[model samples]
Target: KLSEQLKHCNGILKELLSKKHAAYAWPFYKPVDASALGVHDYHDIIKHPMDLSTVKRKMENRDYRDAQEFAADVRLMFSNCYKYNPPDHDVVAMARKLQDVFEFRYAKMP
Candidate 1:
């Protein structure tokens, strides 16, 4: 099952996950921290913004289900983060992370 999940990594992300190595493995991602934590807190923060961009793309194509699914995905992503940490959560902060992560690439894509 784990092997099925990690079929596309190169170095550490690959090796550690491959060996089922949490000791050396690092899922360095943390919950979206747009409100309290400074912008510098996350390692790969692109996840949230990608969510919004996907939603917009789906909406533009008039794919209502996909648009709604993208929004739901964003919520699920944040929920997983919060579930792991179990701290106080803010929906607006989650949105800010979504906006921040997606804006750069959304600007550059075709």
Candidate 2:
């Protein structure tokens, strides 16, 4: 499940950054690779136009009312991982392993 904060942040990544990176927008989705959060399959579901603003606004107006909906979205996202290779593993459990090793690693340019 996702907290509103987490879901909202993820929404930004999905709706804006992912496609931007797909289009090569200053390497937008690099963070996903950096975090090794998951196999971000490009063909599964691209962002909806509204998802960006909705997520941004909800993030701005964050409150308790954003309760289970946020968590639901997070769960929904992980659920979609079945589209990738080796689709039999549990994503929630994967997240736990990720926490210990997760980092938004980036390269340096000189």
Candidate 3:
């Protein structure tokens, strides 16, 4: 089951960033190549978008009252990942792995 936080964040990623930079913004829905880029440490490479303080702030600010509202903050949380122009290989791989956990069951979007 999707956590309230994840559901909100996922809804956010699905609505906004995914519309344009889906591959870069919402790795949870697609796969990215990590090995080719040599990025193996996902924890080190990508800034985790989930923080209690940050989430609380967003919640208090009503940034995530619903999935859509929450998504706005989620994007901000992962902005660094999206902003990495010519993103580091490890980052790419990490993003890819982010969604690979579910990739085996779902078909990737075109």
Candidate 4:
């Protein structure tokens, strides 16, 4: 069933990037420039920074073995956002929304 699970994982990510969720997802499409963003020690603070672009490439490279691994990367991305940004940041709000959608779809994956 691993193959089917992997397929579902891909489907979930595809759905997350579609226009339905892209508005809540644009901020995470690529890596954040720590220096340019003026956030010092970002690398240190977030040892495993994540982004959808990286996740997509990871999928293409067969970096994920299962759904949980794929899901973990997503949480890492959201967690990094929450850790570095203030509680009221716009990105944080969007993270919360997008995470909700991911969790919902991921749960439905059987």
The sequence of per-residue lDDT tens digits that candidate 2 reaches over residues 49-78 is 122234345555663255345444433343
On lDDT, the leading prediction is 4
User: For residues 58-106, could you state the per-residue lDDT of candidate 1 as single tens digits?
Assistant: 4446454432344355455544455444344454344344434433323
Which candidate should be chosen as best, given TM-score against the real structure? 4
Question: Which stretch of 10 consecutive residues in model 4 shows the poorest summed lDDT?
Answer: 1-10
Candidate 4 segments exceeding 4 Å error? none
Q: Mind giving the per-residue lDDT tens digits that candidate 4 earns over 1-110?
A: 33788788888889888998888899999999989988788898888889999988888788898878999999999999999889999999999999999899899996
Evaluate all candidate structures by whole-model CA lDDT and list the values in order: 0.38, 0.37, 0.45, 0.89
TM-score of each: 0.26, 0.30, 0.32, 0.92
Residue pair clashes in candidate 1: 49-102
> What TM value does model 2 have?
0.30
* CA lDDT, candidate 2, residue 89: 53
For candidate 1, report its TM-score: 0.26
TM-score-best of 1 and 4: 4
Q: Among all windows of ten consecutive residues in candidate 1, which has the lowest summed lDDT?
A: 1-10
Better model by lDDT, 3 or 4?
4
